[PDB]
Write a protein that binds this ligand. Structure first.
Ligand SMILES: [Zn+2]
Length: 562
């Protein structure tokens, strides 16, 4: 047997008390009334998750697989990557990253304190000398917020991560590799090179490039658990194709043998929970490995299915394919063959894929293309998503400070959307005004990495990522309007006419503050008035350093880019 996990029966334990019920304050009702619809996952459901993620993996690897792999390795061989110094790697550590078990924390690391640096060096030396001993990991249940979907409650997802010292060593060995290799190997198919607008451009251009377009998303069941020892060694063989220093080569070999392939699982109480033989969700290579492995399996599956003129877009375990239609029956047939190949590769689907002939109806990375109209009346395509989870998370953040501010990330990613503009902007700017906290920088995450963002910089950030049109879109699609309306009914969110009324108040209060606050009032809330101000390029926008923002995925990888 080739089991993803083996377990001792020891429990996955929490670090602090965990809340599952939505916390309520005086502001909660202004956002939503159906409080019992929002929950957070806790370690209490960890056993249910363990059951779901534990299975035997079988893998049959054919000529299509090896052909694509050869191609990937040929591209990888053009990459030159560098070792990061200790200091460079230390500066990439989030200020609140989990402290080391060895007597120092993330602040000590960021400050280059002697004890941290010395220990990191000792971890590094040990990686070079020893390429066999499994490195310890901690297993935790993630506390994440969702809306109930009777389609009831998700069990908590699991996070598996090594000690802080090792994580700094992972950056040193592989940060440059995971940041540069995937776009070289996968080209335009690598999803994390795109801002949301650029992703939309690629998808729309790809769709228009087909005579008779068909598209489909592919949902792998428990992707991390599907990743085998084979997959992880194949990933390492790809990394090693790069032009690397011998010390980097040795560290990558060692991290592969000792950490990436598998290792002991330890709870928060120091007890042995069992043993992992699949992808660790909390390592630097999580996003890059998943993306490469998904792309490899899917590219080979496309060949097996004989899909005509197909283009892929891959973000970790998330996959969308757009190809040439051969008719509805022939397409259904192709997807069945595609699915069979993926399954043989260890990657069977949760929901079976279905052919889609309307681009707007294809969901990938929880998102879809939709269309609205700019100030001139021109059709504009933009990225959107079902607002349920963003709004459930905003409900939580209304009553509780959290390490990651999802509302702020969601405004950045989904600025052009009806719901981010009318609800998220209005609600959160009301709150920040009330506490006079417009100037206070908040942590958020973009493609897995951590940023400290000042809400007063939102107009310039949005202009840079989405263009000026994000401040003037109107006439959204009836499909998008219905979806938003359905979500508001479900969660008990006030109707859009109430948000319009509130936004006029927010806009006025922001304008009354002048400076950056007034720019926010002017640009972010121009949709809320009949008396529309003239929106011109903001000078500060061109000065914003937004490099590294949409380059690569770092989910689980403990990266701070501020
Ligand atoms: Zn065997």
């Amino acid at each position: 047997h080739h089991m993803s996990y083996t377990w001792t029966g020891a429990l996955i334990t929490p670090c602090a008390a965990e809340e599952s019920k939505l916390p309520i304050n005086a502001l909660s009702n202004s956002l939503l009334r159906h409080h019992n619809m929002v929950y957070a996952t806790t370690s209490r459901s960890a056993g249910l998750r363990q059951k779901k993620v534990t299975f035997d993996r079988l893998q049959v690897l054919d000529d299509h697989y090896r052909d694509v792999l050869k191609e990937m390795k040929a591209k990888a061989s053009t990459v030159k990557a560098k070792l990061l110094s200790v200091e460079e790697a230390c500066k990439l550590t989030p200020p609140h990253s989990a402290k080391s078990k060895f007597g120092y924390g993330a602040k000590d690391v960021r400050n280059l304190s002697s004890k941290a640096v010395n220990h990191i060096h000792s971890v590094w030396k040990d990686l070079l000398e020893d390429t066999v001993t499994p490195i310890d990991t901690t297993i935790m249940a993630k506390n994440e917020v969702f809306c109930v979907q009777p389609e009831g409650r998700k069990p908590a997802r699991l996070i598996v991560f090594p000690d802080l010292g090792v994580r700094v060593c992972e950056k040193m060995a592989l940060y440059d590799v995971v940041s540069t290799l995937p776009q070289v190997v996968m080209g335009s198919s690598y999803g994390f090179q795109y801002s949301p607008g650029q992703r939309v451009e690629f998808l729309v251009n790809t769709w228009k490039s087909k005579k008779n377009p068909m598209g489909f998303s592919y949902d792998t069941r428990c992707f991390d658990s599907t990743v085998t020892e084979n997959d992880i060694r194949v990933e390492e063989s790809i990394y090693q194709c790069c032009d690397l220093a011998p010390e980097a080569r040795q560290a990558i070999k060692s991290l592969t043998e000792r950490l990436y392939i598998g290792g002991p699982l330890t709870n928060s109480k120091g007890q042995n929970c069992g043993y992992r033989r699949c992808r660790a969700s909390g390592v630097l290579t999580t996003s890059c490995g998943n993306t490469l492995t998904c792309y490899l399996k899917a590219s080979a599956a496309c060949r097996a299915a004989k899909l005509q003129d197909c283009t892929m877009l891959v973000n970790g375990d998330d996959l969308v394919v757009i190809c040439e239609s051969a008719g509805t029956q022939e397409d259904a047939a192709s997807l069945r063959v595609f699915t069979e190949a993926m399954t043989r590769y260890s990657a069977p689907p949760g929901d079976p894929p279905q052919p889609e002939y309307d681009l707007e109806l294809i969901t990938s990375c929880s998102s879809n293309v939709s269309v609205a109209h700019d100030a001139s009346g021109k059709r504009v395509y933009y990225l959107t998503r079902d607002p349920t989870t963003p709004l459930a998370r905003a409900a939580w953040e209304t009553a509780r400070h959290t390490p990651v501010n999802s509302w702020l990330g969601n405004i950045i990613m989904y600025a052009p959307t009806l719901w981010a503009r009318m609800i998220l902007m209005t609600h959160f700017f009301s709150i920040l005004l009330a506490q006079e906290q417009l100037e206070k920088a908040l942590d958020c995450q973009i493609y897995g990495a951590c940023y400290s963002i000042e809400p007063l910089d939102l107009p310039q950030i949005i202009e840079r990522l989405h263009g000026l049109s994000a401040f003037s879109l109107h006439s959204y699609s009836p499909g998008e309007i219905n979806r938003v309306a359905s979500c508001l009914r479900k969660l008990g969110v006030p109707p859009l006419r109430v948000w319009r009324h509130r936004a006029r108040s927010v806009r006025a209060r922001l304008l009354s503050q002048g400076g950056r606050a007034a720019t926010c009032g002017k640009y972010l809330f121009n949709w809320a008035v009949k008396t529309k101000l003239k929106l011109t390029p903001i000078p500060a926008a061109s000065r914003l350093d937004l490099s590294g923002w949409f380059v690569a995925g770092y989910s689980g990888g403990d990266i701070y880019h501020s």
